[PDB]
Amino acid sequence: GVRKGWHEHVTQDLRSHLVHKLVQAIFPTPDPAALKDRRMENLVAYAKKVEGDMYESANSRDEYYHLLAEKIYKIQKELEEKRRSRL
Amino acid sequence: GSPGYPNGLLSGDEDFSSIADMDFSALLSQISS
Questions:
Q1: Count: domains in chain A
Q2: CA-based nearest distance B1→chain A, Å
Q3: How far apart are CA B29 and CA A35, in angstroms?
Q4: Using CA atoms, how far apart are residues B11 and B17, in angstroms rounded to an integer?
Q5: What is Dmax (Cα atoms) for chain A?
Q6: What is the CATH number of the domain that holds A72?
Q7: Mutate which of B2, B5, B16 to test chain A, going by most A C-beta atoms within 10 A?
Q8: Dihedral of CA B17/B19/B25/B29: which sign?
Q9: Distances from the Cα of B10 to the Cαs of A11, A87, B15, in angstroms?
């Protein structure tokens, strides 16, 4: 496996902002105290898992950040199904 | 042969969609009560 720019560019501080980028699209935060809640940590465990699937699948910085971004627009679809049709 | 072939069909990205409408109602009820 050949290493590209993203591999030496991704930090332990990015992977936390990538998940904080994921939790804000799924549910926007009213208060900074909602991030220390039990029900919130449950989908945090959904978003903590996905980043590692982008590391094996993506070979570029534009694809890696895109795979995490596509779930972000794709989860925005289901919340819209309860909004207009309520189903 | 085969570019990758991901694992998880109908239960890969469709399984948390049942939990994400269960967790969105619990996050609103905990702030307003």
A1: 1
A2: 16
A3: 15
A4: 10
A5: 47
A6: 1.10.246.20
A7: B16
A8: negative
A9: 32, 18, 7
